[PDB]
Ligand binder design. Structure first.
Ligand SMILES: [Cl-]
Ligand SMILES: [Cl-]
Ligand SMILES: [Cl-]
Ligand SMILES: [Cl-]
Lengths: 105, 103, 103, 105
């Protein structure tokens, strides 16, 4: 998440998931894992979400249960626009990545 | 109450088929459905269910570094729920009778 | 099954409010209502109910000089049945949910 | 039941009860008891019912449970006629009984 291209892509993935329905962080973390076979480090999902909230892409809503915080994330209309805008050149991206991949262990 | 205990167990199982859930969520959805609000009762039932091999749980860290629990249905649990279809149908019949005729 | 056991107990109580009955009659009326036909199960439940102070029984000689048993509800039994009204309503809600959504 | 006037009256009572719904013997025995405060001797109800069946006033239907006989009695149309016929002078009967009663301990 600490690399720009990846940070961008993960943002998009989140956004796309949230279009489906609002989600907890743990759900986003799990789906991503299941989709790609790769797990984000503990707590890292929430840092990205924080950023997205700051950016205006997501709104959070928190409950408290033992006095623990249960937060669900919601995509904004702006977040939907960003997703839309930034998903237009994904085919080209994939082609480029493939090429690059042929050069990397 | 034995009747409600059984029914609530099944409701939880049905919820967990949908997707894994926190306790709090189960509690909330139930009240949505029931207008009914349960006394740590939920957690107690969940423990029993885990004892029975129907549910499993794992910890998940949250935004504040707090360890939250998420519950999952097992295959055993699924079958158990599935197995109770006819029992549910019968139960419905009895309740209808009761509600219509208790005098 | 805990759910059905409770429900059948209540059904019996409701029947006995109507008038005292033989076991066989309870068995028959249930199948009418349930299309459901119980395994000496009826007698077993009735014994428990008597243990609980909900039902009493007496012997009655028949046409052949055979001693038949007739079951009666007590006041305790009546209250017990009455007391379960809200539990029944809730149960109905849960069942409806289950039946509509189990997937 | 071993006295004519009483045997007649009890017959009528049975008939009247059966007009309500079919009944077991034990039910007839109980209702009578509750109504009058007086209990027929054991088994005696069934002897009277036998007679009524023979007379065409009642039809019986038996089940078996432990292999015991469970019988329900049903009034016939003839039984209903007899009831009707024989219940027309009951007021006069009551007046006479009252008078008689004034002479008996
Ligand atoms: Cl919005
Ligand atoms: Cl929780
Ligand atoms: Cl019986
Ligand atoms: Cl007839």
């Amino acid at each position: 998440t600490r690399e720009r291209i990846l940070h961008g892509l993960i943002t998009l993935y989140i956004l796309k998931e949230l279009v489906k329905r609002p989600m907890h962080g743990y759900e986003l973390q799990k789906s991503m894992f299941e989709t790609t076979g790769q797990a984000l480090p503990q707590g890292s999902i929430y840092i990205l979400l924080k950023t997205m909230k700051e950016r205006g892409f997501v709104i959070s809503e928190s409950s408290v249960n033992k006095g623990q915080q249960l937060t669900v994330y919601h995509i904004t209309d702006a977040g939907k626009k960003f997703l839309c805008d930034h998903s237009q050149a994904l085919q080209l991206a994939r082609k480029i990545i493939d090429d690059l991949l042929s050069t990397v262990d």
